[PDB]
């Protein structure tokens, strides 16, 4: 599964257009900067830095409320921040890893 972190509205033609928290099934990403990914009916393209991807068991999530930690013992989300898997959960943003409280996330 890939998932858009980013609202993306198409400029060309081609283009597929993303809102934060789509669910995107890849179709070709023989181009390493620019996929192309189904979501319901629609198919085009995207920026591939705009997407994470989400193994199997994990959720999706979007920041209600931001939370900033010392990585030394912790991640950041700002708010509305897309992510992905007592109190904290070990979440990903794609560039860094780590825990954030779980009331600081709504599911979608």
Do not use: H
Request: charged letters at 25%; a neutral charge; one cysteine or more.
């Amino acid at each position: 599964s890939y998932v858009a972190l980013y609202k993306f509205l198409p400029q060309e033609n081609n283009d597929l257009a993303l809102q934060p928290g789509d669910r995107i099934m890849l179709v070709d990403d023989s181009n390493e900067d620019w996929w192309k990914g189904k979501i319901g009916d629609r198919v085009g393209f995207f920026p591939a830095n705009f997407v994470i991807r989400v193994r199997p068991g994990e959720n999706v999530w979007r920041c209600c409320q931001p939370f900033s930690g010392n990585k030394e013992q912790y991640m950041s989300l700002k708010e509305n921040q897309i992510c992905v898997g007592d109190g904290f959960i070990r979440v990903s943003s794609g560039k860094k890893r780590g825990l954030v409280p779980v009331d600081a996330l709504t599911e979608i």
